[PDB]
Design a protein around this ligand. Structure first.
Ligand code: CDL
Ligand code: CDL
Ligand code: LMN
Ligand code: LMN
Ligand code: PC1
Ligand code: PC1
Ligand code: 3PE
Ligand code: 3PE
Ligand code: 3PE
Lengths: 558, 494, 75, 81, 61, 101
């Protein structure tokens, strides 16, 4: 279905040059991904460690199909950013169901809703978006060394294209160059690792590699050192793509330079596909008998990177003043927790891994959604701050500095509380979902004898909390630097709105002002659902946690 | 709907009404303050109904509601003697905290009341949960509302204060969380009725003890880990300060009864000489330090440190008297420290705008109602008899002396220095010359509001100081369950 | 000065300056011979002394119902 | 106090409340009042669905536990020799 | 005056039979075995719940 | 003997004060055992309270002759002071001991 949509969208896109079609194409991509969820919901009625498909080059598991749906749902939520205008006009005289569904309203919308904004004029943006999704879901379902390489390039090349698709921004083309150049080096290490597996084992099949690993784990002439060493080189390339330390330098630069709406997709979708792919490869290569194999296990690169990410993510975030660089470093610290759970290969840690990945993706999505919504809300506000005037790409990244959030609690108190809840979920304060995620990882690491890493995880968490608190302090402890726009409410600056019936006949005529210009419903509702999932998780945890419990039992089923 | 769940629900309804009433009526700020106050009053009324029905000699948790729809993280509530009086202290204190700020907020009043009401639900949840992870979840849930209370309504140095109280508490609690997770892994559950039944191995108990004690020492606080209290309790708004000193300090004390006395008795017995050295050091170093403190609220904040050391020494005495004294002193300190913060942060700081003790002199001449209550609270802070502060200090110190005499004698010396710093402060403020020449305007005496939030606090300490049996009657059988030891001829009856 | 208007005080500059120096003093602490010895006396020795005496004498005595011909020493 | 329908009816009610507060739109204007039944109706539907999911999850987890005691039994019985 | 009045009328009287209001406060707070029944089922249910997790968490890889 | 009041019917321990034979899995019986431990300890101690009470009346009634007339009441308290102390159930619950050792 994703492939039919890509081909069908491309054909419809090929024969048009109208940039006013961009919003419509984004909405059709939402509809198309909804069918993809339907076809994969249909496919979960079986219990198996895996079914190889299509000549054995692909495979399907219950885990694979669950995370296809999650990738689809995250992509639908993100696609809203380019499918609905950021602002709307609301009035009590056009709020009934008979109104929204039988009557129409008319006003000069173009300036109010930013009809011609850059993020509403890119025809091919939803199409490159679906290309990345195809690479991500193919990587999850990959069963072969060549399939691994093709899927990772497919996802990677699309992300480079998305970082540059805003071709008139000097920042975006610069960020696209950086990701491609360092990303291309990372892809050599993946190809080198895959090639070294093939030249030694004689197979591109992951099944066969697992069989070779399993027999060689006994307790002479062809001792299989290649498998751990190759997967070590192979894993390093995947650590770059999740921005794990010490391979993380690119992301604070790339995430800040590319537009925020692009950053939302680019910084979320890629970690889910790589981590899920790594999870299975960690399980089937994990030696049981303490032999010479286990001492050279490639998974120490994951444990070292988790350690290095816990320190770099929290320490370096202390001095960041630009909000997008802070989120990049906040992400690095969270992949430190994710990588600890992947490294401990226990039933408990795999449940913790599965839960942590989903809740962090939801939470990081909220932070970006709140940050974009605050940017779209400042339209009716002005400021005289000299720092804000000297910012580059203000239209692509309206909020660039933490100081821009100063006194946002006095501009929109409830939206500021949603930001605070999300950030407090990042620190791990109970009873927020973020706490329960960190709690499961720590309990699983503690139960497996990972005491030293568990202690560094708690210590770095206090350091990380400092810059989290620093964002909250700017929003709540100070009065804002933004003033409401005088000419929007000046007792005579009122624009007109017509309310018309099914037959385009006038019903009423109302004069409106800037205080009638609100945030669009898609963004407020998405923030409201996710914020309440974060806050109220303790009453809704049974099904969500039981899903991962069952998934791990299938994976571990002796 | 259990009475205990009613306790957690009323303050949430008050939050709903506070934040929606404008859609039904520009609403006046007086309305919000009246909704919040009545909300806390009905919560107090429910806690009094529970106490009438409460049974003093039952080893079953009372007023528990059957869930039976088990999930991963379920909230079970129940109450026995050790938790019943902390619940009452929370319900009595919070209305007084609301009145103590009636006139002194003047901005973001909706946010102040919603934060104050939420803090009540969380703090009550701490004392009512029947699970060790549930305990931790509520002990920590109060940091973000506490962080935002100080920053929104605190004094000049409220940024450094809010960071200190957040990061100290989190860092210590993270070590308590590690200890709690080890317990749940070995036992499979943190529910009280089945975790206390278990028996941990000595070295496990040893490492479980450090993790928990590191958190309880940051929260006591012990001397040297008390920077956060010096900053937060002073920079906080008056209502925040009352809640912080009279309720939040008690969570570590109540947590010693549920997390270490029943499960870690060997570790507690073998490590008392370390707890007592820290407890003895805190009694002396804090007492000497508050003698030289020049900010009136910091002097009163620093007194909390010295008294918290005394009931921290009591809970580790393994004696019936020390444990009863520790709860009675923690309760007594709740009323008296609340009154002393109202006297300093509410009465003096609203009149003068400063808290430096250098500027005050002879206040008795113009303010005889303030001095009358201030003296009675300075007597109670000195452990004078007919205050609940003496009964708690004497019972807490007797247990400390019997368990380990060298620490008892040193902790006893606090009878001198508590008096010393309490009366010395009292004289430099109420006595010690005529009215300070720095005051240009004359000052008015207690308003009716100030008189009645002090009369209420001095009534509770005095009545409980003459008849402490009201509280001791509901602690005798439950306190007995946490004692560890046996007599030569009573053990192993046949 | 604060949110709620207070009475007019003769805010003495010297006393105001003294109360600010105290609140800012922590920023100027330094490690020297004096400050290292005092900080080592209060934090280590005196506490470890009490800990030594508490450890050494834990269980040394019991006073309960002691009579003539029966000592107080328990160990 | 964990009822799937009551909780999720309220969750949908809370989503609408938080949404209107985020938009800084009035919480209760009479022409918009159809939305709370709608939000709570969709919320109730999500929780009837979660009911069926929880039922199937319970059956499958219960089946897995039996397989786990079954595996331990036939391994222990094999060790009797 | 109220303290003198209330104490006198609350006495059990020359005989050991309780007052009219004394019997109400005992009937309402009966709980003869209610806390003993409810607590036992909760403890047993959570003990089994801890057992099921112990099975799943320790399953052979 | 003093008749057993209605109050001293609802709180009588139906079980002996011991932990031998108790299945710690079964909650009712373990809780009853803990109840029997504590109540026996408290019952033994209030004996000292009544003996102390009687000795007080004896002391005043006898004045200077208290050193010679109140002897039996003196010793009975001293024995109780030597033995009776609420020590809890927790040690005995967690530590079995046998006399045939
Ligand atoms: C096979 C060839 C026979 C069919 C091709 C002609 C059909 C008529 C299309 C048309 O409108 O002609 C006028 C059209 C321009 O006329 P117009 O006056 O400008 O109309 C205004 C716009 O076109 C605006 O109107 P439009 O965008 O609706 O018209 C473009 C047209 C383009 O769609 C098509 O031409 C259909 C092509 C396959 C049938 O329709 C669509 O885009 C909507 C449907 C999309 C169908 C996509 C099917 C993808 C393949 C899925 C495979 C898996 C299925 C399971 O010129 C074209 O022929 C466009 C199509 C390009 C021709 C190549 C198509 C084959 C490519 C390789 C085979 C792929 C399979
Ligand atoms: C954890 C999960 C928990 C799940 C349960 C939690 C509670 C669920 C609450 C979500 C309810 C969302 C909602 O219905 O808002 C209505 C929303 C109310 O917003 P409003 O503030 O009253 O006025 C809109 C503004 O004036 C002008 O409107 P606007 O331009 O600002 O926005 C346009 C309109 C978007 O237009 C739509 O309604 C989208 C329709 C797409 C197709 C949905 C039906 C599929 C079947 C089609 C046949 O607004 C939205 O509905 C935004 C929805 C965002 C949901 C995001 C996805 C989850 C996050 O839209 C309406 O105006 C009335 C629509 C009534 C029918 C809605 C479509 C059917 C929904 C069926 C749901 C399943 C049954
Ligand atoms: C806070 C919210 C609580 C958590 C929300 C969902 C948590 C529980 C969802 C469990 C779930 C959804 C997976 C999507 C969620 C992915 C990640 C979601 C984000 C996580 C926040 C996976 O359920 C799968 O779980 C796996 C183990 O976990 C099992 O292995 C699978 O066998 C099982 O199907 C339920 O799947 C189920 O959906 C229902 C459809 O009604 C299906 O019933 C049928 O479907 C069609 C025949 O297919 C029929 O046409 C239809 O007539 C019929 O009805 C089931 O057949 C099954 O497909
Ligand atoms: C102030 C921190 C206290 C935090 C509480 C940790 C919670 C308990 C873990 C303490 C720990 C390592 C402690 C290493 C050094 C501690 C920190 C070093 C200085 C910190 C900066 C004891 O570790 C020892 O435990 C002994 C058994 O008790 C073993 O014998 C030893 O081999 C083992 O090393 C872990 O052991 C524990 O894991 C559990 C499995 O869930 C096992 O059941 C036990 O094995 C249990 O004991
Ligand atoms: C978060 C949880 C998401 C769960 C989605 C789901 O399970 O829907 C099932 C449904 C399954 O539908 P269905 O085909 O089973 O419909 C019911 C069939 N009868 C009538 C027989 C009962 O999947 C979808 O409908 C796909 C579209 C929903 C996704 C839209 C964007 C989100
Ligand atoms: C603290 C304020 C309480 C309310 C203020 C009004 C009362 C203040 C006290 C005034 C004097 C009252 C005692 C007068 C004594 C005269 C004799 C008499 O009436 O005795 C009857 C009764 C005693 O009757 P009794 O002793 O003969 O027998 C019944 C009581 N039982 C069976 C339980 C033993 O005295 C009282 O009830 C007075 C209660 C006063 C307050 C009780 C506790 C208040 C604090 C509760 C919270 C504690 C924890 C806080 C954290
Ligand atoms: C028993 C388990 C309970 C689990 C949690 C259940 C929910 C608990 C409460 C969570 C948050 C609820 C928020 C309730 C207030 C929402 C209504 C509202 O809009 O209040 C607005 C209020 C004032 O703003 P306003 O009046 O609009 O502007 C006037 C300017 N002149 O502005 C405010 O009131 C903001 C108040 C400050 C922020 C709240 C205190 C800090 C909270 C930190 C959030 C993250 C941690 C969440 C912890 C939840 C409880 C543990
Ligand atoms: C600072 C105070 C410190 C107090 C410390 C504790 C007390 C020790 C010091 C006082 C010593 C004597 C105390 C009073 C003893 C007598 C109390 C009394 O009034 O009893 C009479 C009344 C009925 O007698 P009754 O108990 O029924 O006898 C048969 C029962 N078998 O019994 C009653 O129940 C009636 C109770 C009436 C209310 C109490 C009366 C108190 C009298 C002293 C009041 C002092 C405060 C004055 C307040 C301001 C007055 C202007
Ligand atoms: C002026 C007003 C002054 C305050 C008046 C109330 C305060 C009185 C404080 C002491 C109360 C003593 C009276 C009493 O004992 O009430 C107990 C009452 C009896 O009800 P009962 O039949 O025993 O049912 C118990 C089921 N578990 O137990 C109850 O069931 C009462 C239940 C009350 C539920 C309240 C719900 C929220 C109200 C806000």
């Amino acid at each position: 279905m994703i492939m039919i949509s890509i081909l069908s969208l491309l054909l419809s896109t090929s024969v048009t040059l109208r940039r006013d079609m961009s919003i419509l194409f984004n909405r059709i991509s939402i509809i198309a991904l909804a069918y993809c969820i339907l076809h994969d919901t249909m496919s979960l009625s079986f219990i198996s460690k895996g079914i190889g498909l299509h000549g054995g080059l692909l495979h399907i598991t219950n885990l694979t199909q669950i995370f296809h749906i999650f990738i689809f749902i995250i992509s639908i939520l993100i696609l809203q950013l380019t499918s609905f205008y950021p602002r709307k006009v609301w009035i009590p005289e056009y709020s009934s169901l008979k109104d929204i569904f039988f009557n129409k309203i008319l006003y000069y919308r173009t300036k109010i809703i930013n009809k011609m904004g850059e993020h509403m004029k890119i025809i091919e943006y939803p199409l490159i978006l679906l290309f990345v999704i195809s690479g991500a879901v193919f990587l999850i379902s990959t069963n072969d060394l060549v399939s691994i390489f093709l899927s990772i390039e497919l996802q990677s090349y699309g992300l480079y294209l998305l970082s540059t698709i805003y071709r008139n921004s000097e920042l975006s083309t610069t960020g696209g160059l950086i990701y491609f150049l360092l990303g291309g080096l990372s892809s050599c290490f993946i190809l080198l690792g895959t090639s070294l597996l093939y030249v030694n084992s004689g197979t591109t099949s992951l099944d066969g590699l697992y069989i070779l690993n399993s027999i060689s784990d006994v307790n002479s002439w062809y001792k299989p050192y290649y498998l751990n060493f190759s997967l070590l080189i192979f894993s390093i390339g995947f650590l770059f793509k999740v921005s794990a330390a010490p391979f993380h330098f690119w992301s604070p630069d790339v995430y800040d330079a590319i537009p925020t709406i692009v950053t939302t997709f680019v910084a979320i979708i890629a970690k889910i596909s790589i981590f899920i792919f790594l999870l299975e490869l960690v399980y089937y290569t994990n030696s049981n008998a303490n032999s010479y194999l286990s001492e050279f296990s490639w998974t120490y690169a994951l444990l070292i990177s988790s350690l290095l990410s816990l320190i770099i993510g929290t320490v370096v975030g202390l001095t960041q003043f630009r909000i997008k660089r802070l989120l990049a470093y906040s992400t690095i610290s969270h992949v430190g927790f994710i990588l600890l759970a992947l490294s401990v290969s226990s039933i408990e840690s795999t449940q913790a891994f599965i839960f942590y990945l989903i809740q962090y993706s939801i939470s990081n999505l909220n932070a970006f959604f709140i940050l974009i919504t605050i940017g779209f809300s400042l339209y009716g506000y002005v400021t005289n701050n000299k720092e804000y005037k000297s910012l580059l790409d203000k239209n692509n990244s309206p909020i660039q500095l933490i100081s821009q959030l100063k006194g946002y609690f006095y501009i929109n108190p409830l939206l500021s509380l949603s930001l605070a809840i999300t950030i407090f979920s990042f620190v791990g304060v109970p009873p927020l979902v973020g706490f329960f995620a960190k709690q499961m990882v720590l309990s699983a690491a503690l139960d497996n004898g990972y005491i030293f890493l568990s202690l560094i995880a708690i210590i770095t968490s206090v350091i990380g909390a400092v810059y989290y608190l620093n964002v909250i302090k700017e929003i709540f402890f100070y009065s804002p630097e933004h003033e409401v726009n005088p000419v929007l409410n000046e007792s005579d600056s009122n624009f007109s709105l017509r309310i018309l019936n099914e037959k385009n006949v006038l019903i009423r005529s109302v004069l409106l002002k800037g205080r009638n210009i609100f945030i669009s419903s898609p963004f407020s509702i998405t923030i409201s659902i996710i914020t309440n999932v974060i806050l109220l998780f303790i009453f809704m945890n049974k099904e969500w946690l039981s899903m991962g419990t069952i998934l791990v039992q299938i994976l571990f089923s002796a | 709907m259990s009475l205990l769940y009613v306790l957690l629900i009323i303050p949430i309804i008050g939050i709903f009404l506070i934040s929606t009433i404008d859609s039904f009526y520009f609403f006046n700020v007086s309305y919000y303050k009246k909704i919040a106050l009545i909300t806390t009053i009905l919560n107090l009324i429910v806690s009094l109904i529970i106490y009438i029905l409460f049974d003093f000699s039952n080893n079953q948790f009372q007023f528990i509601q059957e869930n039976l729809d088990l999930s991963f993280y379920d909230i079970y509530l129940g109450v026995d003697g050790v938790s019943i009086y902390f619940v009452l202290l929370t319900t009595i204190i919070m209305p007084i905290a609301l009145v103590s700020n009636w006139n002194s907020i003047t901005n973001n009043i909706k946010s102040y009341l919603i934060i104050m009401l939420l803090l009540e639900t969380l703090l009550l949840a701490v004392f009512l949960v029947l699970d060790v992870l549930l305990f931790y979840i509520f002990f920590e849930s109060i940091l973000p509302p506490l962080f935002i209370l100080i920053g929104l309504f605190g004094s000049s140095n409220k940024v450094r204060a809010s960071f200190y109280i957040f990061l100290y508490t989190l860092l210590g609690s993270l070590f308590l969380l590690l200890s709690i997770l080890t317990m749940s892994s070995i036992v499979g559950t943190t529910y009280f009725d089945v975790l206390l039944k278990s028996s941990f191995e000595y070295t496990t108990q040893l490492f479980l003890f450090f993790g928990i004690f590191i958190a309880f020492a940051v929260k006591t606080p012990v001397w040297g880990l008390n920077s956060w209290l010096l900053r937060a309790h002073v920079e906080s708004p008056l209502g925040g300060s009352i809640v912080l000193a009279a309720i939040v300090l008690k969570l570590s004390l109540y947590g010693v009864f549920r997390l270490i006395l029943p499960i870690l008795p060997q570790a507690s017995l073998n490590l008392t000489y370390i707890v007592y050295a820290i407890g003895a050091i805190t009694v002396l170093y804090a007492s000497f330090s508050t003698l030289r403190t020049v900010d009136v609220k910091e002097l009163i904040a620093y007194s909390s440190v010295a008294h918290a050391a005394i009931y921290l020494m009591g809970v580790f005495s393994n004696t019936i008297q020390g444990l009863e004294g520790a709860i009675l002193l923690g309760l007594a300190h709740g009323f008296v420290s609340s009154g002393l913060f109202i006297c300093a942060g509410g009465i003096l700081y609203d009149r003068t705008g400063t808290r430096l003790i250098y500027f005050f002199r002879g206040l008795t001449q113009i303010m005889p109602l303030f001095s009358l209550f201030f003296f009675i609270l300075c007597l109670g802070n000195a452990g004078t008899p007919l205050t609940l502060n003496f009964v708690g200090e004497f019972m807490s110190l007797y247990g400390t002396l019997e368990r380990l005499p060298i620490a008892g004698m040193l902790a006893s010396t606090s009878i001198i220095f508590s008096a010393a710093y309490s009366i010395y402060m009292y004289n430099r403020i109420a006595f010690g010359g005529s009215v300070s020449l720095y005051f240009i305007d004359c000052f008015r005496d207690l308003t009716k509001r100030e008189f009645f939030i002090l009369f209420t606090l001095v009534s509770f300490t005095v009545i409980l100081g003459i008849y402490p049996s009201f509280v001791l009657d509901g602690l005798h059988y439950n306190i007995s369950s946490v004692v560890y030891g046996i007599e030569p001829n009573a053990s192993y009856l046949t | 000065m604060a949110g709620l208007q207070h009475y007019k005080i003769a805010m003495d500059p010297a006393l105001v300056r003294l109360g600010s120096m105290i609140s800012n003093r922590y920023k100027y602490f330094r490690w020297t011979k004096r400050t290292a010895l005092v900080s080592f006396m209060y934090v280590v020795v005196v506490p470890s002394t009490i800990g030594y005496l508490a450890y050494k004498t834990d269980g040394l005595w019991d006073l309960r119902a002691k009579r003539r011909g029966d000592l107080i020493s328990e160990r | 106090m964990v009822n799937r329908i009551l909780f999720w009816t309220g969750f949908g009610l809370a989503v609408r409340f938080w949404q209107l507060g985020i938009e800084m739109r009035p919480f209760f204007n009479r022409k918009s009042l159809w939305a709370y039944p709608l939000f709570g109706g969709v919320g109730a539907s999500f929780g009837y669905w979660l009911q069926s999911i929880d039922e199937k999850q319970t059956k499958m987890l219960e089946e897995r536990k039996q397989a786990i005691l079954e595996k331990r039994a036939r391994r222990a019985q094999r060790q009797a020799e | 005056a109220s303290s003198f009045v209330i104490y006198n009328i609350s006495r059990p009287g020359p005989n050991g039979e309780p007052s009219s209001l004394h019997k109400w406060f005992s009937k309402i707070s009966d709980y003869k075995d209610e806390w003993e029944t409810r607590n036992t089922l909760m403890a047993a249910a959570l003990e089994q719940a801890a057992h099921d997790k112990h099975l799943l968490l320790t399953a052979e890889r | 003997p003093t008749p057993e009041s209605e109050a001293f019917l609802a709180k009588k321990p139906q079980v002996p004060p011991t932990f031998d034979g108790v299945d710690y899995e079964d909650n009712k019986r373990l809780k009853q055992a803990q109840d029997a431990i504590i109540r026996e300890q408290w019952v033994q101690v209030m004996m000292g309270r009544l003996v102390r009470e009687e000795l007080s009346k004896c002391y005043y009634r006898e004045g200077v002759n208290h050193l010679e007339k109140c002897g039996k009441l003196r010793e009975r308290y001293l024995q109780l002071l030597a033995n009776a102390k609420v020590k809890g159930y927790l040690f005995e619950q967690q530590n079995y001991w046998s006399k045939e050792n």
